[PDB]
């Protein structure tokens, strides 16, 4: 079970900008045992800052062929982890991993190799 700081984020299909509503909390990601492809439970929990929008716990599964990641979708923020579900359960998350601050840095964090392995890894394989 691998946990990191993350905020909730507001999505857009409007022009695909995806403007954050910053918050504070932890993402809890569970390694499960479900399947042999996709199927990682993304459950999000607040710790602090009830201001802006809030997301109570929802498990979200990694659905291959509907979920795509990129870190910039607008270049107004980076560190984005995108879970694309065509608005059937869509919610976006904004990582706030402290290693260089909670301020966004484009092309994810400043500990590149460590975050990159995960991001590619959830799509490819499962436990």
């Amino acid at each position: 079970v691998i946990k990191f700081r993350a905020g909730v984020c507001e999505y857009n299909e409007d022009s695909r900008l995806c403007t954050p509503i910053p918050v504070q909390g932890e993402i809890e990601i569970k390694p499960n045992e479900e399947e042999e492809l996709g199927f990682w439970d993304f459950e999000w929990r607040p710790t602090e800052k009830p201001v802006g929008r809030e997301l109570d716990p929802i498990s979200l599964i990694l659905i291959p062929g509907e979920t795509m990641w990129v870190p910039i979708k607008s270049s107004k923020s980076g560190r984005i982890f995108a879970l694309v579900f065509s608005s059937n359960e869509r919610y976006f998350f904004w990582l706030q991993e402290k290693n260089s601050g909670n301020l966004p840095l484009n092309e994810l964090s400043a500990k590149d190799k460590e975050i990159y392995n995960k991001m590619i890894g959830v799509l490819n394989n499962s436990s």
Partner: protein, 70 residues
């Protein structure tokens, strides 16, 4: 000798190293290069801020303890 000289006195000395009150007199930023004081160098110790001509070009930095520890 000791008072007059103690041998081979010009060196190129970087930013943020052991620099004494004596050694601080003789500092000159080259004004033909990118980094020069906003005003003018104070000729003694303390924090000085250098105006940068072009930040688009990479330069070599030193990273702070502020980035590393949160």
């Amino acid at each position: 000798f000791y008072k007059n000289k103690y041998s081979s006195k010009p060196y190129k000395v970087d930013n943020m190293t052991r620099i004494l009150p004596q050694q601080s007199r003789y500092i000159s930023f080259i004004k033909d290069d990118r980094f020069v004081p906003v005003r003018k160098f104070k000729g003694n110790n303390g924090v000085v801020v250098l105006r940068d001509r072009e930040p688009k070009e990479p330069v070599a930095l030193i990273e702070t303890v502020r980035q590393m520890k949160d």
